[PDB]
Amino acid sequence: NTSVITQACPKVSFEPIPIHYCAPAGFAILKCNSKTFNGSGPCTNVSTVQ
Amino acid sequence: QNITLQCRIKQIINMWQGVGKAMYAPPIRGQIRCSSNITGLLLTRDG
């Protein structure tokens, strides 16, 4: 079985904007600043951002 | 210069949101374009 719905289709403008994520109070985000980083393992230059 | 890709605008879309299909309204009359920056690729390799 399937479930099918329909909706009104006004067309809308669609142009993605940058969205950033921010730490809640009590937390912080560590960031890897290496020029070379393969996605895993130790990063030797780390900074903290919100 | 100017490698051209053949593109089509479609109404029946397989959703990325989950498994399922969806129909969208037909194309807009007028001129539609976008200029984008290619910043990366998704590549795969087999055995």
Epitope: T2, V4, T6, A8, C9 | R8, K10, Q11, I12, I13, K21, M23, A25, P26
Partner: antibody
């Protein structure tokens, strides 16, 4: 595309009628279909619409609890089923449809016009 | 709800004249309209669809214009074979709630 109607029928109120329509001459799945009714002395009445690429259908407000439209994708046949049938439903029934450019490839245009028509099937109640 | 009516119940015209038919809707159409020609014993063949675009195979006689909820169909140089009942169809509802009007007789 040609649309081929089924035979005439006679029912009593409280029963039901299911009328087939065979569509041929092109690939079935690329055509959208509707059903239209016309009681003698009356104008045309839209009953409903079926999308064949996505099995989805809609019915006119007074038929929502009475009508089901089915597209049999394997036989290229559309069926109109009317339930809880009344003498008020005596009419000539017929199928119609229209081509959706490259619907198979996802270019379906939701075309609301009817170009291909059946002959008219008389159903009395 | 959606209903379409014609101005004339019947249209009194002679062959060779330009017949004028006029459809009015209870709801805005915004060019999503079509016209059909109904003869006794025949399917209601589509002649005009989308504002006034002629369907393939439609005589040049058939043409028209319109906007909003008021649309006109005309038949130039009307022939005797064109003395049909014409129907106006509106299909711009979604979910579909398409209708045909009462029509008019030539």
């Amino acid at each position: 595309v040609q649309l081929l109607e089924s035979g005439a029928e006679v029912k009593k109120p409280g029963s039901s009628v299911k009328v087939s329509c065979k569509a041929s001459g092109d690939t079935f799945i690329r055509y959208s279909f509707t059903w239209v009714r016309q009681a003698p002395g009356q104008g045309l009445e839209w009953m409903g619409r079926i999308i064949t690429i996505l099995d989805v259908a809609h019915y006119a407000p007074h038929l929502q609890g009475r009508v089901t439209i089915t597209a049999d994708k394997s036989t290229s046949t559309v069926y109109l089923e009317l339930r809880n049938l009344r003498s008020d439903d005596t009419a000539v029934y017929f199928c119609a449809g229209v081509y959706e450019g490259e619907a198979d490839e996802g270019e379906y245009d939701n075309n609301g016009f009817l170009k291909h028509w059946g002959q008219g099937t008389l159903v009395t109640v | 709800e959606l209903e379409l009516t014609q101005s004339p119940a019947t249209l009194s015209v002679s062959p060779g004249e330009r017949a004028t038919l006029s459809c009015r809707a209870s709801e805005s159409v915004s060019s999503d309209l079509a016209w059909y020609q109904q003869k006794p014993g025949q399917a209601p063949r589509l002649l005009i669809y989308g504002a006034s675009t002629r369907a393939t195979g439609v005589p040049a006689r058939f043409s028209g214009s319109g906007s909003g909820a008021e649309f006109t169909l005309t038949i130039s140089s009307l022939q005797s074979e064109d003395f049909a009942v014409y129907y106006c169809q509106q299909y711009n509802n979604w979910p579909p709630r398409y209708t045909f009007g009462q029509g008019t007789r030539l």
